[PDB]
Scaffold this motif. Structure first.
Motif, mmCIF file in Angstrom:
data_model
loop_
_atom_site.group_PDB
_atom_site.id
_atom_site.type_symbol
_atom_site.label_atom_id
_atom_site.label_comp_id
_atom_site.label_asym_id
_atom_site.label_seq_id
_atom_site.Cartn_x
_atom_site.Cartn_y
_atom_site.Cartn_z
ATOM 1 N N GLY A 160 1.242 15.129 4.033
ATOM 2 C CA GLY A 160 2.549 14.502 3.183
ATOM 3 C C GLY A 160 2.635 13.248 3.036
ATOM 4 N N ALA A 161 2.005 12.511 3.965
ATOM 5 C CA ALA A 161 2.011 10.942 3.858
ATOM 6 C C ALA A 161 0.970 10.448 3.157
ATOM 7 C CB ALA A 161 1.980 10.365 5.485
ATOM 8 N N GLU A 211 1.566 8.352 -0.071
ATOM 9 C CA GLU A 211 0.839 7.179 -0.631
ATOM 10 C C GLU A 211 0.417 7.262 -1.976
ATOM 11 O OE1 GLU A 211 -3.033 7.364 -0.932
ATOM 12 O OE2 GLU A 211 -2.843 5.448 -1.522
ATOM 13 N N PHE A 241 3.427 7.116 -4.622
ATOM 14 C CA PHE A 241 4.355 5.952 -4.252
ATOM 15 C C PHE A 241 3.660 4.716 -4.807
ATOM 16 C CE2 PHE A 241 5.406 2.144 -2.002
ATOM 17 C CZ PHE A 241 6.885 2.246 -2.238
ATOM 18 N N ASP A 242 2.114 4.631 -4.596
ATOM 19 C CA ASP A 242 1.459 3.596 -5.355
ATOM 20 C C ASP A 242 1.526 3.925 -6.971
ATOM 21 O OD1 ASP A 242 1.108 2.269 -2.918
ATOM 22 O OD2 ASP A 242 -0.936 3.177 -2.682
ATOM 23 N N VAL A 266 7.384 10.386 8.125
ATOM 24 C CA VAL A 266 6.403 10.173 7.226
ATOM 25 C C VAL A 266 6.693 8.594 6.581
ATOM 26 C CG1 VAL A 266 5.806 10.538 4.444
ATOM 27 C CG2 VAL A 266 6.065 12.464 6.240
ATOM 28 N N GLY A 267 7.766 8.338 6.404
ATOM 29 C CA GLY A 267 8.079 7.127 5.984
ATOM 30 C C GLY A 267 7.715 5.904 7.054
ATOM 31 N N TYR A 316 3.932 5.597 7.458
ATOM 32 C CA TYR A 316 3.207 5.228 6.249
ATOM 33 C C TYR A 316 3.507 3.760 6.175
ATOM 34 C CZ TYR A 316 1.666 3.937 1.712
ATOM 35 O OH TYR A 316 1.084 3.490 0.497
#
Ligand code: HEM
Lengths: 101, 54, 439, 55, 49, 414
Positions: free
Chosen positions: D23-24, D28, D31-32, E45-46, E49
C-alpha cells in the motif's frame, strides 16, 4: 602402546607448567554454568583446599615465582575428584536435551 | 526471563526510556526536551552533509 | 486392559422427566451410600437490583422453619437418621443435597421435599440471619481470593446482572422483606427448572414414585438475557498486605463449544502451581519451572470458568510486589507460545493430564453427582466418559493453535489487581504485550 | 465491512507489514500523480512543458 | 468492602454499538480493532514513505 | 463389580491387598508404619525431611526423569503421614502402572540424598512449616501431643526451628536402613491384578520401636490473637478395642463437626450446655486419637478472650453430668447411627477408601470388612460407656492452650 603412552603423558605433564605452580587437574578447568555447578557440588574441605591452591598459584604468578623442587606436584599423585561430578553434569545436561527433544 | 532486565545495555534503556516512572500530569509544555534532542541530532546530520560539501 | 476395558464396564446414570417439568437422574451402581440432591438453576444472574443477594439469603434461610416441622426438630431428624447435609448457591445454580445412607432414602426424599418447597419464615429468624450474613460479609473481607474474583466479574461484566455480587451489598442485605423473598422463591425455584439427582445404592422405581409423591403437585408457569464481556482494569491499592493477588481473564466460550474441550487441554497444560510442591527446579510445566527458577511468583491457577454459554478464560496468580511484572510477562509469553509454536509432546501431556484429572475428579459419589446436576442443568444431559475420551482424542495441535488463535491472540482482557499492586504495569503495557510482532 | 478487512490483512504482523509496504508503493504512485496534476492545474500556462511543447 | 461496590458507568464514552448489556461481543471486536489498526497502519504507511 | 479383595501376606513380611475391578482410577498405595514415633531425641524433624524427599535422585533413576515421566503420564503422586504412618499414593489409569511402580520402588529403596538437594530441601522445610502452622489449630494439636507424652508420641509432624538447615542426610540413610523392613510394608492395589503385584513385590525388593508413656501437665502459648484455643485431653485406650469403640460412641454423643451446614447440633450436649450458659460466639468439640499402643481423648474449645473459662467450665460439667450415670438411650442409638454413618461415609472416595483399606489391613496386620465392624459397633453397650466416662472424669489431665490467656483455668478450675 600403553607403556610408551605413559611416557608421553608424563612428558606432557612436565611441559604443561601447572605442576610447577603447585596445581592439579581440577585447578585449571574453564567454566560455564555447568563446571561452576560442579564446583558448587563439592565437599567443604576439598573446596577449601582448592581455593587455597588457587590463591597460592595466583600469588606465585603475581610475583612470577615458580615453587622449588620440593613442591612440584608429582605426576599420578593427584586426584581426579571432579570426574564423578562433572560426569553426572554431562549426563544430566544430555538427559535434558535428549528428553525434551 | 527476558533480555531487557538481564542485559547490561537494555538495563540502561529500560531505566531511561521504558520503566522510567513518568508523572501523569505533564502538558505539552514538557514536550520541548525530546524536541531539543531530535533537533540536535538533525542539526548534526544536516551539518555533516554540509561538511561533506564544504 | 485398555480404555475399552475400562469404558465397557462403566456407570450409566439413567434419567427421566417427571410430568411437572421435573427432571430426575440416577447414578446406579454398587456403592453402599446415597447422595440425593436438588439442583435448581437459580443464582445472582437471574436476580434484579432490589433482589440482589436474595438467593444467598434463601440458602441461609432454608432451615429456619417449615410448615411441618420447626427448625431444631428438622435438623434433629437429619441427625437422628445419621446423615450429612449441605447446600450452596453460586451466581447461576443452587444445590441442596444430602449425603446419606441407602436405608434412609425415602425419609431423605420426604424431608428434602419439604426443605425445597414449603419453608416457613420468622421475624426473629430474618433478624438473626441478617446479623449473621452481615458478620460473614465482614468475614469475607478476609478471603482475598473471592474478593479478587468478584472484582473480576464486576469489572468484566459492567452493567449486566452477571456482575451482581454473589451475596448482595450491605444495604441490600439490611433492607429486604418477606414479601420480596416469597416472590423470589415463587419465581425461581419452582416448576421447570429443577433436576433431582441421586447417586449410589439406589434404584429407579421406588425413588421414582417417591419423587412423584413428594415433589409433584406444583405446576407453576422470562429471564436470562445474553451477556456482554467488556475487558477493563480495576485495582485495589492497599500497600500494607504482605502479598498481592493479580488475576486477568479473557472472554472464554462457555459451555456449548468444543472450544471448551480445547481450553481444558490448554489449562491442563498450564493449570495449577502452589509454592509447597515437591521438586522445584525440575518441573514439567515450563511456566512453573521459570516461576521456581527465579521465584517469579508464589502461586497460580490458570483455568476457565463457564457461565451460561459465556466464559472467563482466566489466570490468577499470587505473588509479592517485587516481581509482579516478571510473572506477568512470562504469562503472556506462554500464551503466545501456545498461540504460535504448539509442539507435539506438550499436547500429548495435556491430554494425559486431562484424562487423569477428570478421572480423579470423578471420585466418590458427592463430586460425581454434583457433576451430574451441573451437567443436566447446562448441557441438558450427562456426558459419558467415553464421549470425554473421544473428544480428547478428537483434538491435536492444529485445533489447539486455532483455539489459541481465536481466544488468546490479540483480544481485550479484564484485569483485577489487589494489594501491593503499584508495580503492576499499566493496562496499555498488558495490551501491547498481548500481541506479538515477535517482540 | 471494516471487520472483514481486519480479518483479511491485519492479523499476522509479517503479512501486515508486507501489505502496508504494498500500500505504501500504491500510495507513492497515487500521491505523485495527485501532486503533479494539482500543481500543473494551479500552474496551467507558465510551466516549461507547455513552452517546450511549443518548441 | 467489596460487596458494597457498584462500578461507575461510562455511558458517555463507549461506542454506540456496544451500549447494550443484552448484546454479545464475540464479533464486534473485529470492527473496532480494524478501525484502530487501520489508523496505525495508515500512519505507518505515511511514516515509511 | 461383584468380585472382591484378595489378601496375601507374603511371609518374608509384607502385605499385598489387591482389588481387581473394572475401574479407571488405578491407585497404588505403599503404606509403611514409619511415622514420627520412631525417631529419638537426636534427629528431630527427620521424618518431615523424608516426607518432602519424594523428588530426589536414586541409583539409576534421576529426579529429572522421575518428575518428567510421572507428570508426563499424567499420574499424580502424593505422600501423607500420621505419627505412625507414611503413605506413598500414586494415582493413574491402567496405562503405565508398571513403569510407575518401578519409579515407586526406586524412590523407596534406592536412597542417595545428594547434598545440594538436601540444602534446597531445608529451605523447602521452612516454607512447608510456615504454610502448615499458619493454621493455629494444628499448632494446638502439636502442643497437645507435646503435653501428653515423654516418649515417641510426643514428637512432631514437622521439624523444630533449629534443626532446619542442620539435619544431615547420613541420618536419613541410617534411618531408612534401620526402619524399612519387608515386615512392615503394605502394597495396596486398586485397579491392577494380584499376580502382577505378586511378581513385582516378590522379585523386586527382598531386603529385610518404642511405646508410649503418659506425661501430663499443660502447655500455654501466649500469642495475643483474640481466639483462645484450648484442648483438654486425657489418655483413653489402645486401638482395636471395644473400649476404643466406646470412646468413639461417646464422642458422637458429646459432639463433632456439624452434620448440617449452618446448623445448631442439638444432640451435641456440649454445645447445648455452653449455649444454655454462655451467649457469645464460640465452638466446642470432642477429640479422639488412637494408636497401636495408646490413645488420647478429650474436648477442644475455641472461644473469645474474656469468655474462655465459662466455656471450659460448662463443657466439663456437661461431661461430668453425663458421666454421673445420667444419659439417654436414644442418644446411644443416635451415636451408634452417627458412628455407622461416619465409618460408612468416610470410605466412598477412592483416596480415602484406599487409605482406610490399607491402614485397616496394615495396622494390626489383618483386614477386617466393614460389616463386622458395624457388628462390633452394635456390640458395645452402656457399661463401658459409663466406665470410660468415669475413667476420663476421674483420671489425670493434660491441657494445651494458645492465644490470649487472660482468664484460662489451669487444671483444678475446670
Ligand atoms: C556537529 C554537527 C554540525 C556540523 C558538522 C555543522 C557544520 C556546519 C557548517 C559546515 C556550516 C556552514 C554552512 C552554512 O553556514 O550554511 C554550518 C553553519 C551553521 N551551523 Fe552548523 N553544524 C553542526 C551542528 C550545528 C548545530 C548543533 C547548530 C546549532 C543549532 C549549528 C548552527 C549553525 C548555524 C547557526 C550556522 C549558520 C548558518 C548560516 O549562517 O548559513 N550547527 N554548520
Amino acid at each position: 602402546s600403553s607403556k610408551w603412552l605413559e611416557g608421553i603423558r608424563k612428558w606432557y605433564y612436565n611441559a604443561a607448567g601447572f605442576n610447577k605452580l603447585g596445581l592439579m587437574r581440577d585447578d585449571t578447568i574453564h567454566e560455564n554454568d555447568d563446571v561452576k555447578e560442579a564446583i558448587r557440588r563439592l565437599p567443604e574441605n576439598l573446596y577449601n583446599d582448592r581455593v587455597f591452591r588457587i590463591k597460592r598459584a595466583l600469588d606465585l604468578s603475581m610475583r612470577q615465582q615458580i615453587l622449588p623442587k620440593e613442591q612440584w606436584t608429582k605426576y599420578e599423585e593427584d586426584k581426579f575428584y571432579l570426574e564423578p561430578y562433572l560426569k553426572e553434569v554431562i549426563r544430566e545436561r544430555k538427559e535434558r536435551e535428549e528428553w525434551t527433544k | 526471563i527476558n533480555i531487557r532486565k538481564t542485559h547490561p545495555l537494555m538495563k540502561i534503556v529500560n531505566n531511561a526510556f521504558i520503566d522510567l516512572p513518568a508523572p501523569s500530569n505533564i502538558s505539552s509544555w514538557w514536550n520541548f526536551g525530546s524536541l531539543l534532542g531530535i533537533c540536535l541530532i538533525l542539526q548534526i546530520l544536516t551539518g555533516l552533509f554540509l561538511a561533506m560539501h564544504y | 486392559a485398555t480404555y475399552a476395558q475400562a469404558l465397557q464396564s462403566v456407570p450409566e446414570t439413567q434419567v427421566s422427566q417427571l410430568d411437572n417439568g421435573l427432571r430426575v437422574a440416577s447414578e446406579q451402581s454398587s456403592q453402599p451410600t446415597c447422595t440425593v440432591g436438588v439442583w435448581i438453576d437459580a443464582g445472582s444472574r437471574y436476580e434484579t437490583e432490589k433482589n440482589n443477594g436474595a438467593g444467598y439469603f434463601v440458602e441461609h434461610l432454608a432451615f429456619k422453619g417449615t410448615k411441618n416441622r420447626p427448625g431444631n426438630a428438622l435438623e434433629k431428624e437429619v441427625e437422628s437418621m445419621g446423615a450429612h447435609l449441605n447446600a450452596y448457591s453460586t451466581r447461576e445454580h443452587t444445590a441442596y443435597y444430602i449425603k446419606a445412607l441407602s436405608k434412609d432414602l425415602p425419609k431423605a426424599v420426604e424431608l428434602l421435599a419439604d426443605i425445597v418447597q414449603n419453608c416457613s419464615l420468622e421475624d426473629s429468624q430474618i433478624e438473626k440471619e441478617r446479623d449473621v450474613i452481615l458478620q460473614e460479609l465482614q468475614e469475607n473481607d478476609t478471603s482475598m481470593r473471592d474478593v479478587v474474583f468478584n472484582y473480576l466479574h464486576a469489572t468484566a461484566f459492567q452493567g449486566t446482572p452477571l456482575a451482581q455480587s454473589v451475596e448482595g451489598p450491605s444495604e441490600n442485605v439490611r433492607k429486604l422483606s418477606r414479601a420480596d423473598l416469597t416472590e423470589y422463591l415463587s419465581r425461581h425455584y419452582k416448576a421447570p427448572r429443577m433436576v433431582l439427582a441421586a447417586a449410589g445404592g439406589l434404584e429407579h422405581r421406588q425413588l421414582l414414585d417417591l419423587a412423584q409423591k413428594h415433589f409433584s403437585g406444583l405446576s407453576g408457569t422470562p429471564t436470562l438475557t445474553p451477556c456482554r464481556f467488556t475487558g477493563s482494569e480495576i485495582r485495589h491499592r492497599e500497600d500494607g498486605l504482605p502479598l498481592a493477588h493479580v488475576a486477568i481473564a479473557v472472554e472464554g466460550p462457555g459451555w456449548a463449544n468444543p472450544d471448551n474441550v480445547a481450553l481444558q487441554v490448554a489449562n491442563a497444560i498450564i493449570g495449577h502451581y502452589d509454592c509447597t510442591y515437591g521438586g522445584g527446579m525440575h518441573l514439567s510445566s515450563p511456566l512453573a519451572s521459570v516461576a521456581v527458577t527465579n521465584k517469579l511468583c508464589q502461586s497460580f491457577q490458570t483455568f476457565n470458568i463457564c457461565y451460561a454459554d459465556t466464559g472467563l478464560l482466566g489466570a490468577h496468580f499470587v505473588c509479592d510486589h517485587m516481581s509482579i511484572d516478571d510473572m506477568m510477562f512470562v504469562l503472556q509469553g506462554q500464551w503466545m507460545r501456545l498461540c504460535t509454536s504448539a509442539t507435539e509432546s506438550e499436547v500429548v501431556r495435556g491430554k494425559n493430564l486431562l484424562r487423569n484429572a477428570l478421572v480423579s475428579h470423578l471420585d466418590g459419589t458427592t463430586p460425581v453427582c454434583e457433576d451430574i446436576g451441573r451437567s443436566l442443568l447446562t448441557y441438558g444431559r450427562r456426558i459419558p466418559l467415553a464421549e470425554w475420551e473421544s473428544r480428547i482424542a478428537e483434538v491435536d495441535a492444529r485445533v489447539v493453535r486455532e483455539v489459541c488463535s481465536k481466544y488468546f491472540y490479540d483480544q481485550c482482557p479484564a484485569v483485577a489487581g489487589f494489594g501491593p499492586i503499584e508495580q503492576l504495569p499499566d493496562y496499555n503495557r498488558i495490551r501491547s504485550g498481548m500481541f506479538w510482532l515477535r517482540f | 465491512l471494516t471487520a472483514r478487512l481486519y480479518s483479511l490483512l491485519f492479523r499476522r504482523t509479517s503479512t501486515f507489514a508486507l501489505t502496508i509496504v504494498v500500500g505504501a508503493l500504491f500510495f507513492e504512485r497515487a500521491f505523485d500523480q495527485g501532486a503533479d496534476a494539482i500543481y500543473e492545474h494551479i500552474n496551467e500556462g507558465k510551466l516549461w512543458k507547455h513552452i517546450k511543447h511549443k518548441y | 468492602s467489596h460487596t458494597d461496590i457498584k462500578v461507575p458507568d461510562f455511558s458517555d464514552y463507549r461506542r454506540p454499538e456496544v451500549l447494550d448489556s443484552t448484546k454479545s461481543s464475540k464479533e464486534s471486536s473485529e470492527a473496532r480493532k480494524g478501525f484502530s489498526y487501520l489508523i496505525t497502519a495508515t500512519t505507518t504507511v505515511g511514516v515509511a514513505y | 463389580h461383584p468380585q472382591d479383595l484378595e489378601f496375601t501376606r507374603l511371609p518374608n513380611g509384607l502385605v499385598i491387598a489387591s482389588l481387581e475391578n473394572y475401574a479407571p482410577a488405578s491407585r497404588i498405595g505403599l503404606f509403611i508404619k514409619a511415622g514420627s514415633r520412631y525417631e529419638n531425641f537426636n534427629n528431630l524433624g527427620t521424618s518431615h525431611l523424608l516426607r518432602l524427599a519424594s523428588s530426589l535422585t536414586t541409583k539409576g533413576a534421576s529426579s529429572f526423569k522421575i518428575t518428567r515421566g510421572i507428570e508426563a503420564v499424567g499420574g499424580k503422586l502424593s505422600v501423607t503421614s500420621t505419627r505412625e504412618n507414611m503413605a506413598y499414593t500414586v494415582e493413574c489409569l491402567r496405562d503405565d502402572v508398571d513403569i510407575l511402580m518401578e519409579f515407586l520402588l526406586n524412590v523407596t529403596t534406592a536412597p542417595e540424598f545428594r547434598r545440594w538437594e538436601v540444602a534446597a530441601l531445608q529451605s523447602q522445610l521452612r516454607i512447608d512449616k510456615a504454610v502448615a502452622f499458619q493454621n493455629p489449630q494444628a499448632h494446638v494439636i502439636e502442643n497437645l501431643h507435646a503435653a501428653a507424652y515423654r516418649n515417641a508420641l510426643a514428637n512432631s509432624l514437622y521439624c523444630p526451628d533449629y534443626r532446619i538447615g542442620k539435619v544431615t542426610p547420613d541420618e536419613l540413610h541410617d534411618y531408612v536402613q534401620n526402619h524399612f523392613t519387608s515386615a512392615r510394608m503394605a502394597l495396596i492395589g486398586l485397579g491392577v491384578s494380584h499376580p502382577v503385584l505378586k511378581q513385582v513385590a516378590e522379585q523386586f525388593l527382598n531386603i529385610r520401636g518404642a511405646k508410649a508413656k503418659y506425661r501430663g501437665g499443660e502447655i500455654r502459648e501466649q500469642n495475643g490473637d483474640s481466639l483462645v484455643h484450648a484442648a483438654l485431653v486425657a489418655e483413653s485406650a489402645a486401638i482395636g478395642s471395644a473400649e476404643a469403640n466406646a470412646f468413639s460412641v461417646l464422642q458422637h454423643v458429646l459432639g463433632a463437626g456439624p452434620h448440617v451446614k449452618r446448623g445448631s447440633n442439638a444432640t451435641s450436649s456440649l454445645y447445648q450446655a455452653v449455649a444454655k450458659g454462655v451467649h457469645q460466639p464460640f465452638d466446642v468439640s470432642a477429640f479422639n486419637a488412637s494408636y497401636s499402643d495408646s490413645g488420647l481423648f478429650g474436648f477442644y474449645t475455641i472461644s473469645q478472650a474474656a469468655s474462655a473459662g465459662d466455656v471450659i467450665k460448662a463443657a466439663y460439667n456437661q461431661v461430668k453430668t453425663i458421666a454421673q450415670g445420667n444419659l439417654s438411650n436414644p442418644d446411644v442409638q443416635a451415636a451408634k447411627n452417627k458412628l455407622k454413618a461416619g465409618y460408612l461415609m468416610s470410605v466412598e472416595s477412592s483416596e480415602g477408601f484406599l487409605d482406610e483399606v490399607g491402614c485397616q489391613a496394615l495396622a494390626a496386620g489383618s483386614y477386617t470388612p466393614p460389616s463386622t465392624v458395624l457388628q462390633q459397633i452394635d456390640a458395645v453397650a452402656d457399661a463401658d460407656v459409663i466406665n470410660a466416662a468415669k475413667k476420663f472424669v476421674s483420671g489425670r489431665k493434660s491441657m494445651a492452650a494458645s492465644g490470649n490467656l487472660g482468664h484460662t483455668p489451669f487444671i483444678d478450675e475446670l
